[PDB]
């Protein structure tokens, strides 16, 4: 899932 700290991770 897209999370704000992690950018493209799992997104």
């Amino acid at each position: 899932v897209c999370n704000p700290l992690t950018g493209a991770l799992l997104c």
Partner: antibody, heavy 111, light 114 residues
């Protein structure tokens, strides 16, 4: 947000451990990330999991020897760490969206 | 993978001093989408890391005014004005631009001078 990790683990070289991380306070809205803290305090990101859909991304150093899972019935994430060696004697953190950290789980590898 | 070099690695200060920590990455942390996924954590002794600054300069929930993050591209700085005891611990920078893996700086220990 609170992340409750399981207690200390002790294994022989070669073995595996399974550690848990119980989240409280939206379990499915954040990737659950895992990070090792080594003895000299350096940090190494192991991987993360999407808890609604179950997709995973790994640090290639850990790929093939660590497996992330979740249980949505109990908002609990898990890490199965295989192939243990002395370098794995460390503290392992779960981290919700890289924002909030659990208290850590010690793993000690000794014969 | 991105190498995150912090300097100094140990920073002795006096109470009330201004403290400055540098974090340099081996490649740019500005992502194609315009964001710079550079964050700062503090781990106080005996505790877990806690998020201080996200996306270069944004203070997280409850983080005092005396912490500020600056920089761009490959060169970042955390500044801690009016150091007090509760500030002592290990500061880490972290990048989530080039992933996997997320990487971290080695940690800068903020300690007292005598």
């Amino acid at each position: 947000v609170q992340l409750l990790q399981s207690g200390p683990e002790l294994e022989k070289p070669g073995a595996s451990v399974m550690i848990s991380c119980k989240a409280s306070g939206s379990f499915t809205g954040y990737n659950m990330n895992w990070v090792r803290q080594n003895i000299g305090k350096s940090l190494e990101w192991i991987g993360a999991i999407d808890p609604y859909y179950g997709g995973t991304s790994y640090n290639q150093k850990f790929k093939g020897r660590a497996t992330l899972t979740v249980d949505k019935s109990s908002s609990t994430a898990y890490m199965h760490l295989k192939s243990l060696t002395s370098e794995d004697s460390a503290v392992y953190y779960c981290v919700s969206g890289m924002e909030y950290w659990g208290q850590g789980t010690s793993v000690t590898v000794s014969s | 993978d991105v190498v995150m070099t912090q300097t100094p690695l140990s920073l002795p200060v006096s109470l009330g001093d201004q403290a400055s920590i540098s974090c340099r990455s081996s490649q740019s942390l500005v992502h194609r989408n315009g964001n710079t996924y550079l964050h700062w954590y503090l781990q106080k002794p005996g505790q877990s890391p806690k998020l201080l600054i996200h996306k270069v300069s944004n203070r997280f929930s409850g983080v005092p005014d005396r912490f500020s993050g600056s920089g761009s591209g490959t060169d970042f700085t955390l500044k801690i004005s009016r150091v007090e005891a509760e500030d002592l611990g290990v500061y880490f920078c972290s990048q989530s631009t080039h992933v996997p893996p997320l990487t971290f700086g080695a940690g800068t220990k903020l300690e007292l001078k005598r």
